[model samples]
Target: IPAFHPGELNVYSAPGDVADVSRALRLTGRRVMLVPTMGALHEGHLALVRAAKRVPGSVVVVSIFVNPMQFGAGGDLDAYPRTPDDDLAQLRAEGVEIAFTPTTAAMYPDGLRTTVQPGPLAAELEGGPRPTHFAGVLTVVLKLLQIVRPDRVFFGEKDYQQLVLIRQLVADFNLDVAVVGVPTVREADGLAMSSRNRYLDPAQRAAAVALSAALTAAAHAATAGAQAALDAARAVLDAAPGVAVDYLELRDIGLGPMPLNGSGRLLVAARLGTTRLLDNIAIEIGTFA
Candidate 1:
């Protein structure tokens, strides 16, 4: 709780030690902000940190752990890219007050068998393909919130469904922290920024652009009507040989099913080579109708 400057931050290797972090804040009654990540830091990650920093808090904590439980047996857990030193440097450069980098052993400990599921919200989006993915996400997020005990947590809307599930988890459990979402950060060409994009080869990355393009086209078609939008998106995706469409849905902002005639999101996740990419667009119906 001692007054901390912009450059001062704490780095921890154990979840148990997070209690002391909470105690420090309580001792001074200072508010704290949390920015959670699965390492593999990217611009999107930095955006979250910046969002956290722009809060009424004396401390900002950035957690860098590639949670394993979130990844299915054959998922990219092992291959998930990581750059510890680089991630640390980036956090420090961003003026993060604390960097929580817990090891798998520390986070899981012994007899670590538990999962958090948010039901329907999890079933959609990344859930259908990566079963138990949201369970892993919710569990880790719950653990991180317990440790940091921040007044608020910042999340990127790029992971819209994940953000929704986490918000529900906070509400369902009566967690004391608030979950805040930042706008999705995208590349100049419109591709949503993601840590997984690091795995793409040059050709795969080039082809990956179609996913965003298709979403834009879908949004444009929505003004014309649902059928036109669907046709436009399917056409764009079908033509991209390098990309395999996993799912393309038009759902309410919370990702729930809704009448296509209203404003909603066009969510798409597809595979370009071995890398999976996701992108979405918000649209108004009759405008494009």
Candidate 2:
């Protein structure tokens, strides 16, 4: 009988309070769906929220915790935008009923003890330069999963690698919850919606489009074969101004170590000066003559 269903959003800073309410609702046959995030909620997070809301009998629970455990350096952690008031307002407007905005102390009340360990993929791509990055992410995500005990969890495909890692985390742990990857929300010009996008200055904003453009180029040229697709995207990426290509890889659907064959993903990461951008697309090798 809690006010946690499609009406007024209930915000909880205590994990146990959210857990108890979610459990009560679940026992009453309500499907609890979770959307975990850092608090700068934008269009990308909005997409996740909207997806959770549409689930049959679902009560959306979105957690906004800026986990310092995931930061590579304390500096980056401090710089992450904090818009608690705006974030809660958006959740309310979106008709999300449960917002778990736990404190750093509440989330890790005992301080990090044993953490969830991610597998090989954790050290690749986005995690390549920051090996512990995926570990921290998996740890926090697992805690959220344990705390909310939702029937399903939502994440954006914009963070495809992170999404993939979360999948691995769920599978490897044998957790009882469905992992849903909502399509990446994009701006009118195709730039993936991300909080980091706010950091882009006027010029960097123009160059950031190269990430999505390159991915699309690869997808279009994929019918010729994998090499052709790579070449096409590479050509477009090369045209980016003052951009540093972090990595451009086409991996198997599950992002395994093997190269692309039938259908796979073409992923890219680059830095337009200071703002780093990520994008990816699904591609088939030599399909449809």
lDDT of each: 0.80, 0.88
lDDT of 1: 0.80
Q: Per-residue lDDT of 1-289 in model 2, one digit per residue for the tens?
A: 3445447788888888899999998998999999999989998898899999899888999999999888986599889999888998898889898999888888887898999888899888999889899899999999999999999999988888999989998888899999999988999988998889999999889988888888888888988888899999899989988879989999998899776568888899888877788888888888541
Poorest stretch of ten by lDDT in candidate 1: 1-10
**Model 1: per-residue lDDT, tens digit, 195-268?**
87878888887888888888888877776787788789989988876888888888777677555547777788
- Candidates' TM-scores? 0.90, 0.96
Stretches of candidate 2 off by over 4 Å are 1-6
* Candidate 2, residue 79: how far the Cα is off, in Å: 0.7
**Candidate 2 TM-score, true structure as reference:** 0.96
Score residue 49 of candidate 1 by CA lDDT: 85
Which residue pairs clash in candidate 2?
none
Evaluate candidate 2 by giving its C-alpha RMSD to the native, one decimal: 1.5
